[PDB]
Amino acid sequence: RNSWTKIYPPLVEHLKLQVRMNLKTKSVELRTNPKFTTDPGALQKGADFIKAFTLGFDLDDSIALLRLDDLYIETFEVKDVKTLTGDHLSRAIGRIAGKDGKTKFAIENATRTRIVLADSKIHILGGFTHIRMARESVVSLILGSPPGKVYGNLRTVASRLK
Amino acid sequence: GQKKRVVDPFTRKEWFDIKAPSTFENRNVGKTLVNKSTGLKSASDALKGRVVEVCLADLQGSEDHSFRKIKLRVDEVQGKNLLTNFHGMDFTTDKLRSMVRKWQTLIEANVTVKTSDDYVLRIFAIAFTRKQANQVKRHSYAQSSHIRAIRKVISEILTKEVQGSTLAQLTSKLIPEVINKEIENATKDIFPLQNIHVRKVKLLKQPKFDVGALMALHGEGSGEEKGKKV
Amino acid sequence: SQVFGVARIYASFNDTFVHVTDLSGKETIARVTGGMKVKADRDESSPYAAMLAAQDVAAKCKEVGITAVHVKIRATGGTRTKTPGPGGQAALRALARSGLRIGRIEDVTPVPSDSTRK
RNA sequence: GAGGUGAAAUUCUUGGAUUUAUUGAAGACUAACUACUGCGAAAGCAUUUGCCAAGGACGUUUUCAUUAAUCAAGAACGCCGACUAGGGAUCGGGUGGUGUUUUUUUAAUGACCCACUCGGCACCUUACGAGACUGGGGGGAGUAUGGUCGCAAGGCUGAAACUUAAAGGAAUUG
């Protein structure tokens, strides 16, 4: 509701398609108008745009998924590795978020991706090899490492980026 | 070693189309390939076991059945048409993942019921505990005896809705979601219960064929066709 | 007017599968995976490989006579990652870009429902 | 071609692997719902239905009448205390109120809101008190060492009793 006035002109004047918000099933439907909308993949790009926004990234990051179409959005769970009973799960999300977000923002600003993380399922959007870099740093940290060591490894991956 | 040389396998393929039973709206659902009708595996018995998974929105024209895919089993071939019968029903996974929220309970039940035909069906049910309007506590849990009583009346009234239906009558009963309204009306004496659904219907055994019953589900038909002109 | 197949895109890590079958799923039309288009043995999951595989999928589907596909996009599922790889969205985009109409995108990865871990 | 990896590889594969569809069998497991919630003496316990006994809290103008509390031995299973008040939320029971969901001459039976009250798992505070599978050297961070115990250098190898071959090393603008 609060970001709808910034979502749809990137779906009507920037892109070429039309929107409706069902309050029936509380969803967003996207039609492509037949007689003047170009760009035969624009329906798929705008659908994945609002998919990123409803999945949890901010709307400027989802616009970054709309423009520059080679940014995909990987997802995985905490529960796949080390099986994480709930106290250790709290350790896991607190360890990935750091203090005042600084570790997550470090993984953001270094490997050029942007992540968001729900209570047991995290999402990384960006370009695919940087997604793999961020995913391996995250899974090392969720297996449980000193954040100084993951800062050092992040300095090396930033040196790959430079 | 040496593998194989290709010979194009779409020259021996035959196109049939799938006519759905008349317990639905618009009944041409699509087409299907099969190998060409040769001796030693004719095509009309290379078919007859295939189930297709269609969307109830595509079968009913609306979009409030955008979930709830169904299965249609091919039974009788006549004249490049595959006449189907109902074979099951299933939600998409995103629907019940979109329904499950924490701070409530899901009461789910299932019963194995034999209809007025000799089809036996395992038919499921899900229901989620609502909170009333003016409720200020954030929980709205059921006290698990309310769960046992709700699950009891769910089992009783939906095994009353089966046995009192055939397959065609049950299918026409669960298209407009009205067994859910029966569960809601019968259960609001115990707990509020938002969005009760049936969610899944499985065939277990099927009686016999009865071509007459299938053709009465669809419509008639018999052919005297062309004659060779020599 | 459309003839509908189904897409059956299985996009794990390490590989992607673009495998159009008919409306039942019994008869296949051009299974081509990601690792058979270009193989460095590690670019099998890449969006370029998924775009190549979906592009010659759509070539053979236009050859046979299928105009549209219902998309069933799954991941490896099971007791594992449960979410598609980098090739799923690329294969879907290349299938739409290469002439085929898309309908009914749905996520049919096998959620394991009480699995066999420990 | 499929796994798989940071890349690879062992492995499977034209006697058709992987993918897809239908079906069967097996052994586990009980996803999301799932909580600073519940139950259990603890370890622990999550699908449905039934049976078997059990247990707790509450309600009680029921009954017995001191039958009680703590633990060495033995048996079964495997910032503190003797301390004041509170506050919000939640679980189980009870009482009262009087609105909405419920509903009716088939049985009884809900859900929510509010106040009170008993008992729990926690949390946030307050006020006031002497609260007197066994074996052990002696602080932290360093610094020096004409003592004792060790380990360690040389120097082209071959090659020493032999100024000794081949080959190698090193440095090398013959």
XYZ file of C-alpha atoms (C1' of nucleotides) in Angstrom:
684
model
C 0.000 0.000 0.000
C 2.767 2.425 0.920
C 4.914 1.666 -2.126
C 2.203 1.296 -4.751
C 2.605 4.847 -6.046
C 6.244 4.123 -6.908
C 5.683 0.630 -8.307
C 3.232 1.040 -11.129
C 4.726 3.887 -13.275
C 7.764 1.610 -13.678
C 5.108 -0.844 -14.915
C 3.126 1.532 -17.150
C 5.320 4.318 -18.481
C 8.798 2.825 -18.089
C 7.780 -0.707 -19.017
C 4.748 -1.465 -21.199
C 1.981 -3.537 -19.550
C -0.950 -3.046 -17.206
C -1.536 -3.904 -13.578
C -4.387 -4.753 -11.266
C -4.363 -5.578 -7.563
C -6.882 -8.247 -6.641
C -8.290 -7.746 -3.218
C -10.119 -10.990 -4.027
C -7.126 -13.273 -3.522
C -4.854 -10.467 -2.232
C -2.511 -10.700 -5.191
C -1.172 -8.744 -8.165
C -2.114 -9.636 -11.714
C -0.213 -8.342 -14.726
C -1.732 -8.257 -18.185
C 0.152 -7.329 -21.306
C -1.842 -5.019 -23.530
C -1.851 -6.449 -27.038
C -1.992 -3.502 -29.356
C 0.754 -1.188 -28.164
C 3.059 -2.929 -25.659
C 6.487 -3.868 -26.980
C 9.256 -6.010 -25.434
C 7.977 -9.634 -25.464
C 9.817 -10.419 -22.190
C 8.538 -7.357 -20.316
C 5.695 -9.333 -18.745
C 8.178 -11.749 -17.213
C 10.503 -8.977 -16.076
C 7.710 -7.010 -14.400
C 6.317 -10.132 -12.778
C 9.694 -10.945 -11.287
C 9.977 -7.270 -10.254
C 6.909 -7.435 -8.028
C 7.999 -10.936 -7.005
C 11.219 -9.511 -5.588
C 9.290 -6.732 -3.862
C 6.787 -9.084 -2.271
C 9.576 -11.486 -1.384
C 11.259 -8.896 0.734
C 13.771 -6.668 -0.992
C 13.155 -2.962 -1.095
C 11.535 -1.375 -4.111
C 14.691 0.257 -5.453
C 16.372 -3.154 -5.367
C 13.421 -4.605 -7.207
C 13.707 -1.813 -9.787
C 17.324 -2.952 -10.022
C 15.911 -6.338 -10.927
C 13.639 -4.687 -13.498
C 16.272 -2.682 -15.326
C 19.513 -4.567 -16.109
C 17.701 -7.840 -16.738
C 20.629 -10.181 -15.887
C 20.107 -10.136 -12.101
C 18.512 -13.287 -10.728
C 17.323 -14.065 -7.232
C 18.533 -17.139 -5.393
C 16.918 -18.465 -2.245
C 17.840 -21.012 0.364
C 17.104 -22.008 3.936
C 18.915 -22.207 7.244
C 17.590 -25.735 7.797
C 19.504 -27.361 4.929
C 22.885 -27.296 6.711
C 23.670 -28.226 10.349
C 19.904 -28.643 11.149
C 19.914 -25.695 13.605
C 17.837 -26.242 16.721
C 16.105 -23.016 17.643
C 18.642 -21.549 20.067
C 21.382 -22.143 17.508
C 19.010 -20.696 14.896
C 18.853 -17.480 16.901
C 22.661 -17.576 16.992
C 22.590 -18.039 13.213
C 20.412 -15.076 12.304
C 22.113 -12.857 14.874
C 25.483 -13.895 13.477
C 24.513 -13.157 9.883
C 22.952 -9.825 10.781
C 25.861 -8.862 13.041
C 25.242 -5.803 15.186
C 23.134 -3.024 13.619
C 23.209 -4.854 10.301
C 26.906 -4.261 9.685
C 27.853 -7.798 8.643
C 24.927 -8.150 6.234
C 25.684 -4.714 4.836
C 29.320 -5.765 4.424
C 28.281 -8.792 2.358
C 26.017 -6.423 0.418
C 28.554 -3.688 -0.381
C 31.394 -6.057 -1.137
C 29.908 -8.605 -3.522
C 27.488 -6.139 -5.166
C 24.383 -8.183 -4.393
C 21.589 -7.381 -1.978
C 20.218 -9.877 0.493
C 17.200 -10.060 2.747
C 16.554 -12.699 5.345
C 13.364 -13.970 6.930
C 13.274 -16.104 10.061
C 14.577 -19.277 8.420
C 14.897 -18.500 4.701
C 17.212 -15.992 3.066
C 17.207 -14.455 -0.398
C 20.130 -13.049 -2.397
C 19.557 -11.052 -5.574
C 22.217 -9.885 -7.988
C 24.393 -11.322 -10.716
C 24.887 -15.048 -10.706
C 28.573 -15.487 -9.877
C 28.365 -12.811 -7.183
C 25.351 -14.725 -5.900
C 27.563 -17.791 -5.608
C 30.268 -15.763 -3.826
C 27.782 -14.306 -1.353
C 26.175 -17.703 -0.825
C 29.475 -19.336 0.027
C 30.385 -16.539 2.461
C 26.953 -16.814 4.063
C 27.079 -20.591 4.360
C 30.571 -20.370 5.895
C 29.298 -17.828 8.417
C 26.205 -19.930 9.137
C 28.410 -22.935 9.722
C 29.997 -20.608 12.223
C 33.235 -18.723 11.746
C 34.959 -15.711 13.251
C 33.584 -12.578 11.573
C 37.130 -11.244 11.391
C 37.993 -14.243 9.225
C 34.962 -13.691 7.037
C 35.946 -10.018 6.744
C 39.370 -11.143 5.540
C 37.879 -13.548 3.011
C 35.551 -10.741 1.973
C 38.556 -8.467 1.423
C 39.999 -11.127 -0.873
C 36.751 -11.448 -2.834
C 36.598 -7.661 -3.086
C 40.149 -7.876 -4.456
C 38.772 -10.253 -7.081
C 36.123 -7.609 -7.757
C 38.587 -4.703 -8.131
C 31.388 -47.428 -28.817
C 28.890 -46.919 -31.633
C 25.617 -45.408 -30.521
C 22.756 -44.977 -33.058
C 21.658 -42.934 -36.071
C 18.487 -40.864 -35.736
C 15.226 -41.385 -37.660
C 12.704 -38.596 -36.865
C 10.149 -39.867 -34.324
C 7.494 -37.211 -35.053
C 6.483 -38.797 -38.343
C 4.976 -41.762 -36.481
C 3.118 -39.615 -33.931
C -0.648 -39.170 -33.867
C -2.601 -36.261 -32.370
C -5.671 -36.932 -30.230
C -7.585 -34.320 -28.292
C -9.011 -34.687 -24.823
C -12.730 -34.263 -24.261
C -13.469 -33.681 -20.568
C -16.614 -35.010 -18.843
C -19.747 -32.894 -18.920
C -19.650 -32.132 -15.185
C -17.557 -29.128 -16.249
C -17.749 -26.154 -18.543
C -15.804 -26.010 -21.842
C -14.494 -29.469 -22.412
C -11.792 -29.351 -25.087
C -8.726 -29.206 -22.854
C -5.905 -29.802 -25.321
C -4.243 -32.478 -27.404
C -1.946 -35.454 -26.823
C 0.639 -37.352 -28.819
C 0.804 -41.105 -29.183
C 2.626 -43.419 -31.577
C 0.781 -44.206 -34.791
C -1.800 -46.965 -34.600
C 0.085 -50.008 -35.834
C -0.605 -53.636 -35.148
C 1.210 -54.963 -32.054
C 0.438 -51.976 -29.708
C -2.487 -50.147 -31.275
C -2.674 -46.517 -30.204
C -6.093 -46.776 -28.573
C -4.596 -49.095 -25.955
C -1.302 -47.235 -25.867
C -3.671 -44.633 -24.438
C -6.423 -45.357 -21.812
C -4.052 -45.173 -18.855
C -2.880 -41.607 -19.212
C -4.020 -39.042 -16.701
C -3.762 -35.371 -17.533
C -3.462 -32.619 -14.957
C -5.508 -29.607 -15.963
C -6.408 -26.432 -14.134
C -9.946 -25.966 -12.915
C -9.743 -22.357 -14.094
C -9.037 -23.633 -17.599
C -11.892 -26.099 -17.227
C -14.392 -23.620 -15.797
C -13.586 -20.277 -17.429
C -13.194 -18.366 -14.163
C -10.110 -17.432 -12.158
C -11.178 -18.131 -8.576
C -10.276 -21.732 -9.454
C -6.737 -20.670 -10.356
C -5.505 -23.112 -7.729
C -7.091 -26.584 -7.447
C -5.715 -28.555 -10.354
C -7.536 -31.764 -11.233
C -6.688 -35.033 -12.935
C -8.638 -36.563 -15.805
C -8.060 -40.217 -16.677
C -8.398 -41.372 -20.277
C -10.911 -44.203 -20.476
C -12.451 -44.621 -23.942
C -11.078 -43.677 -27.360
C -13.453 -43.008 -30.227
C -12.798 -41.106 -33.445
C -9.620 -39.223 -32.482
C -11.220 -38.165 -29.194
C -10.103 -39.166 -25.719
C -13.112 -39.255 -23.429
C -12.023 -38.728 -19.858
C -13.398 -39.219 -16.370
C -12.531 -37.639 -13.031
C -9.394 -39.062 -11.452
C -8.502 -36.763 -8.578
C -8.091 -33.261 -7.317
C -5.212 -31.417 -5.727
C -4.283 -27.940 -4.650
C -1.180 -26.229 -5.801
C 1.452 -26.047 -3.080
C 1.456 -22.253 -3.124
C -2.205 -22.145 -2.087
C -1.790 -23.980 1.191
C 1.563 -22.327 1.830
C -0.333 -19.060 1.323
C -2.930 -20.237 3.821
C -0.656 -21.399 6.652
C 0.034 -18.661 9.218
C 1.433 -18.983 12.713
C -0.695 -18.125 15.760
C -3.543 -20.413 14.702
C -4.096 -24.141 14.369
C -4.656 -26.148 11.215
C -7.167 -28.952 11.691
C -6.788 -31.406 8.839
C -8.831 -34.546 8.337
C -9.169 -37.319 5.786
C -11.604 -40.157 5.181
C -11.557 -43.197 2.901
C -15.118 -43.422 1.591
C -16.741 -45.628 -1.048
C -19.282 -43.748 -3.161
C -22.636 -44.832 -4.620
C -20.572 -46.394 -7.389
C -17.753 -48.695 -6.296
C -15.113 -45.988 -6.487
C -13.310 -45.675 -3.171
C -11.808 -42.256 -2.530
C -9.404 -40.889 0.010
C -10.696 -37.354 0.453
C -8.873 -34.784 2.555
C -9.800 -31.562 4.313
C -7.940 -28.612 5.778
C -9.269 -25.854 8.005
C -7.582 -23.050 9.910
C -8.726 -21.563 13.208
C -9.955 -17.994 12.738
C -10.020 -15.226 15.303
C -13.272 -13.415 15.907
C -13.818 -9.739 15.294
C -13.263 -7.912 18.642
C -10.743 -10.599 19.665
C -7.799 -8.812 21.252
C -5.623 -11.769 22.224
C -3.251 -12.599 19.424
C -3.475 -16.368 19.517
C -6.861 -17.947 18.621
C -5.752 -21.499 19.233
C -8.128 -24.395 19.534
C -8.018 -26.406 22.739
C -7.410 -29.758 20.911
C -10.685 -31.173 22.169
C -12.265 -28.599 19.922
C -9.846 -29.988 17.316
C -11.040 -33.552 17.932
C -14.686 -32.468 17.831
C -14.182 -30.352 14.693
C -12.311 -33.191 12.982
C -15.094 -35.549 14.059
C -17.818 -33.442 12.482
C -15.633 -32.892 9.400
C -15.278 -36.645 8.921
C -18.978 -37.317 9.583
C -20.451 -34.685 7.314
C -18.086 -35.209 4.432
C -18.583 -38.966 4.567
C -22.260 -38.004 4.472
C -21.602 -35.890 1.364
C -19.985 -38.935 -0.214
C -22.357 -41.993 -0.140
C -25.137 -39.844 -1.410
C -23.124 -38.950 -4.456
C -21.701 -40.659 -7.490
C -18.415 -39.502 -8.998
C -20.219 -37.108 -11.330
C -22.412 -35.835 -8.510
C -19.431 -35.418 -6.188
C -17.449 -33.609 -8.881
C -20.343 -31.249 -9.571
C -20.608 -30.828 -5.794
C -16.968 -29.845 -5.271
C -16.657 -27.549 -8.264
C -18.573 -24.658 -6.580
C -16.829 -25.223 -3.221
C -20.030 -25.970 -1.352
C -18.882 -28.867 0.816
C -16.646 -26.195 2.386
C -19.759 -24.157 3.150
C -21.328 -27.253 4.691
C -18.274 -27.726 6.909
C -18.287 -24.046 7.912
C -21.986 -24.032 8.805
C -21.687 -27.304 10.691
C -18.601 -26.193 12.610
C -19.282 -22.574 13.627
C -20.899 -23.972 16.795
C -17.414 -25.017 17.987
C -14.773 -22.683 16.503
C -14.841 -19.914 13.870
C -12.591 -21.685 11.290
C -11.532 -19.543 8.323
C -10.941 -20.985 4.807
C -11.956 -24.618 5.056
C -10.980 -26.482 1.897
C -11.033 -30.034 0.561
C -7.542 -29.681 -0.962
C -7.076 -33.260 -2.210
C -9.163 -36.138 -3.585
C -7.527 -39.447 -4.524
C -9.021 -42.410 -6.326
C -7.990 -45.692 -4.752
C -9.987 -48.361 -6.589
C -12.331 -48.057 -9.544
C -15.123 -50.597 -10.119
C -15.257 -51.634 -13.770
C -15.444 -49.739 -17.010
C -19.158 -49.367 -17.963
C -18.832 -47.682 -21.369
C -22.536 -46.865 -21.154
C -22.006 -44.871 -17.963
C -19.054 -43.007 -19.472
C -20.938 -42.208 -22.670
C -23.860 -41.044 -20.557
C -21.460 -38.762 -18.735
C -20.352 -37.329 -22.094
C -22.957 -37.747 -24.842
C -23.870 -40.317 -27.458
C -22.149 -41.290 -30.709
C -21.813 -44.004 -33.363
C -20.333 -43.938 -36.855
C -20.889 -45.411 -40.273
C -18.135 -43.646 -42.019
C -17.009 -43.505 -45.623
C -16.711 -46.522 -47.889
C -13.931 -47.099 -50.400
C -14.869 -45.824 -53.859
C -13.856 -48.846 -55.974
C -6.098 -21.768 -31.173
C -3.032 -22.567 -29.100
C -1.652 -26.057 -28.665
C -0.305 -26.499 -25.150
C 2.601 -28.547 -23.917
C 4.188 -28.336 -20.506
C 7.661 -27.062 -19.768
C 8.966 -29.129 -16.796
C 11.966 -26.907 -16.113
C 14.054 -28.560 -13.400
C 16.707 -26.046 -12.415
C 19.028 -27.381 -9.776
C 22.444 -26.155 -9.032
C 25.070 -27.768 -11.325
C 22.458 -28.276 -14.107
C 19.188 -27.205 -15.658
C 16.631 -29.293 -17.547
C 14.242 -27.826 -20.114
C 11.965 -30.696 -21.029
C 8.704 -30.024 -22.844
C 6.233 -32.878 -22.764
C 2.593 -33.047 -23.824
C -0.369 -32.152 -21.617
C -0.264 -35.546 -19.910
C 3.492 -35.806 -19.442
C 3.771 -39.242 -21.041
C 5.230 -38.129 -24.394
C 8.318 -35.913 -24.562
C 9.206 -33.210 -27.095
C 12.912 -32.216 -27.006
C 14.463 -32.747 -23.653
C 17.725 -30.818 -23.832
C 19.548 -30.142 -20.572
C 21.951 -27.340 -19.782
C 25.140 -29.325 -19.783
C 24.713 -30.527 -23.341
C 24.617 -27.108 -24.958
C 27.960 -25.776 -23.753
C 29.986 -27.797 -21.278
C 32.890 -26.486 -19.346
C 31.314 -28.933 -16.797
C 30.680 -25.994 -14.431
C 28.706 -23.635 -16.681
C 25.930 -26.208 -16.969
C 23.714 -24.256 -14.578
C 24.516 -20.876 -16.105
C 21.849 -18.589 -17.603
C 23.613 -18.788 -20.966
C 23.311 -22.578 -21.002
C 19.684 -22.436 -19.903
C 18.952 -19.883 -22.631
C 20.562 -22.118 -25.265
C 18.641 -25.183 -24.058
C 15.318 -23.360 -23.949
C 15.972 -21.837 -27.368
C 16.384 -25.116 -29.182
C 13.539 -26.565 -27.083
C 11.347 -23.836 -28.558
C 12.742 -24.619 -32.007
C 11.571 -28.235 -31.783
C 8.242 -27.268 -30.185
C 7.512 -24.887 -33.055
C 8.575 -27.711 -35.369
C 6.096 -30.188 -33.891
C 3.295 -27.655 -33.587
C 3.095 -26.510 -29.989
C 2.387 -22.800 -29.643
C 2.191 -22.459 -25.870
C 3.507 -24.167 -22.763
C 2.304 -24.451 -19.200
C 5.386 -23.882 -17.090
C 6.180 -26.225 -14.202
C 9.370 -24.963 -12.582
C 10.952 -27.172 -9.937
C 14.145 -27.258 -7.920
C 16.014 -30.233 -6.538
C 13.709 -30.298 -3.493
C 13.621 -33.341 -1.269
C 15.837 -33.039 1.787
C 17.791 -30.349 -0.042
C 17.826 -26.790 -1.249
C 14.107 -26.556 -2.269
C 14.683 -23.478 -4.498
C 15.539 -23.266 -8.261
C 19.010 -22.475 -9.633
C 20.141 -19.625 -11.861
C 18.828 -21.419 -14.943
C 15.122 -21.525 -14.157
C 14.289 -17.887 -14.811
C 16.659 -17.872 -17.791
C 15.029 -20.928 -19.352
C 11.599 -19.408 -18.763
C 12.708 -16.122 -20.331
C 14.220 -17.843 -23.354
C 11.092 -19.968 -23.831
C 8.988 -16.820 -23.837
C 11.462 -14.874 -26.019
C 11.564 -17.681 -28.614
C 7.964 -17.468 -29.739
C 6.201 -19.777 -27.283
C 3.353 -18.377 -25.234
C 3.622 -18.969 -21.477
C 0.769 -20.029 -19.232
C 0.254 -21.283 -15.679
C 3.617 -20.906 -13.982
C 3.674 -23.141 -10.928
C 6.281 -24.341 -8.455
C 6.296 -28.127 -8.188
C 9.501 -28.867 -6.312
C 9.101 -31.842 -3.925
C 8.633 -30.438 -0.420
C 9.526 -33.574 1.511
C 6.719 -33.493 4.140
C 8.515 -35.038 7.248
C 11.674 -36.302 5.623
C 14.354 -38.930 6.172
C 17.218 -36.857 7.575
C 18.018 -38.318 10.995
C 24.939 -37.274 -21.206
C 23.863 -37.379 -15.498
C 26.136 -36.796 -10.495
C 29.385 -33.898 -7.933
C 32.875 -30.002 -7.069
C 36.140 -23.793 -6.038
C 37.510 -26.654 -10.231
C 37.881 -32.040 -10.961
C 37.687 -37.178 -10.061
C 35.782 -42.212 -8.123
C 30.510 -43.621 -9.919
C 26.125 -44.495 -13.551
C 25.309 -44.452 -18.799
C 22.899 -46.259 -26.392
C 22.139 -53.877 -22.205
C 19.008 -46.174 -22.461
C 21.799 -43.017 -17.342
C 19.566 -38.228 -15.795
C 14.483 -35.958 -16.943
C 8.926 -37.125 -17.535
C 4.292 -40.182 -16.599
C 1.657 -44.490 -14.164
C 2.114 -48.122 -10.385
C 4.207 -51.247 -6.608
C 7.609 -52.465 -2.396
C 10.708 -51.107 1.671
C 12.622 -48.750 5.945
C 12.346 -44.416 8.470
C 10.106 -39.715 9.649
C 5.909 -36.784 11.327
C 7.346 -30.654 7.339
C 4.871 -25.770 7.462
C 1.020 -25.096 12.029
C 5.669 -24.723 16.112
C 5.648 -20.290 20.425
C 10.911 -17.411 25.354
C 3.704 -22.263 24.462
C 2.103 -27.449 26.665
C 3.073 -32.215 29.215
C 6.552 -35.413 31.940
C 10.506 -37.013 38.188
C 14.596 -36.369 34.727
C 16.522 -38.225 30.166
C 12.497 -36.440 27.040
C 7.538 -36.156 24.133
C 4.533 -33.500 17.801
C -0.037 -37.631 11.960
C -5.536 -39.877 12.815
C -8.631 -43.047 15.543
C -9.543 -46.551 19.497
C -8.329 -49.294 23.922
C -5.450 -49.649 28.617
C -4.150 -47.762 33.062
C -1.975 -43.023 34.952
C -1.193 -37.767 36.296
C -1.863 -32.431 37.391
C -4.517 -27.871 38.265
C -9.309 -26.235 39.447
C -14.461 -26.937 41.818
C -16.232 -29.073 46.563
C -20.982 -26.731 53.164
C -17.394 -34.955 50.634
C -14.163 -38.207 53.793
C -9.837 -39.695 57.294
C -7.643 -37.049 61.284
C -1.496 -35.677 62.138
C -1.351 -39.845 58.969
C 3.816 -34.984 58.075
C 9.437 -32.242 55.869
C 14.625 -33.293 54.636
C 18.313 -36.361 52.931
C 24.056 -40.336 54.034
C 22.823 -46.101 52.918
C 19.449 -48.820 49.390
C 15.917 -49.117 45.085
C 13.480 -47.485 40.171
C 14.179 -44.563 35.541
C 18.242 -42.707 32.810
C 24.303 -12.481 43.625
C 22.343 -15.651 46.946
C 17.578 -16.627 50.689
C 14.075 -17.837 55.516
C 12.350 -12.401 51.483
C 7.907 -7.580 50.273
C 4.972 -5.935 46.719
C 3.640 -5.428 41.971
C 3.176 -4.964 35.923
C 2.192 -6.735 31.052
C 1.514 -11.103 28.239
C 0.305 -16.428 28.087
C -1.465 -21.810 29.471
C -5.351 -24.965 32.522
C -9.749 -24.513 35.804
C -13.659 -21.653 38.220
C -17.256 -17.431 39.311
C -19.900 -13.104 37.647
C -21.334 -9.500 33.839
C -24.056 -8.798 29.214
C -23.017 -7.858 23.700
C -21.431 -10.182 19.223
C -20.619 -14.576 16.687
C -23.777 -18.940 17.818
C -28.909 -20.680 17.394
C -34.750 -23.515 16.494
C -38.592 -29.143 20.321
C -32.895 -34.651 18.957
C -28.694 -35.100 23.267
C -25.352 -31.912 25.690
C -21.676 -28.612 24.128
C -19.129 -23.728 22.182
C -15.842 -18.967 20.327
C -14.750 -13.888 21.743
C -14.871 -9.286 25.226
C -14.431 -7.657 30.546
C -13.595 -7.950 35.892
C -12.233 -11.242 39.850
C -9.736 -15.712 41.602
C -6.599 -20.359 42.064
C -2.420 -22.951 40.018
C 1.726 -23.070 36.178
C 6.209 -21.835 32.130
C 8.714 -17.537 31.674
C 9.852 -12.167 31.471
C 10.299 -6.852 33.508
C 10.991 -4.514 37.937
C 10.853 -3.273 43.331
C 12.139 -3.687 49.627
C 14.906 -6.380 53.072
C 17.970 -10.006 55.345
C 24.390 -12.348 57.888
C 24.341 -15.041 53.727
C 29.469 -16.325 58.824
C 33.845 -38.870 37.978
C 39.888 -39.022 42.567
C 45.058 -37.282 42.083
C 46.606 -29.879 42.868
C 50.648 -25.682 42.971
C 50.100 -20.626 43.774
C 48.883 -14.583 40.644
C 49.100 -11.899 35.614
C 52.549 -9.794 32.086
C 57.525 -10.047 31.083
C 63.375 -9.721 31.305
C 68.320 -11.552 32.141
C 71.425 -16.116 32.244
C 79.862 -17.608 32.723
C 74.676 -22.976 36.339
C 72.639 -28.361 34.535
C 70.430 -31.203 30.566
C 69.711 -31.270 25.416
C 69.302 -29.906 19.976
C 72.031 -27.440 16.641
C 77.657 -25.063 12.886
C 81.482 -26.367 9.392
C 81.975 -26.730 4.358
C 81.143 -28.087 -3.395
C 79.452 -33.755 -3.492
C 81.668 -38.072 -5.657
C 86.547 -38.379 -2.559
C 89.554 -41.491 1.160
C 94.478 -44.877 3.032
C 94.215 -42.211 -3.180
C 94.831 -34.066 -4.528
C 91.209 -39.589 -8.183
C 87.048 -40.735 -13.081
C 82.020 -39.994 -14.894
C 78.093 -37.040 -13.601
C 75.756 -33.207 -10.850
C 75.696 -28.413 -8.245
C 77.054 -23.273 -8.031
C 78.442 -18.872 -10.390
C 78.035 -18.068 -15.271
C 77.776 -11.071 -20.996
C 83.810 -18.401 -23.345
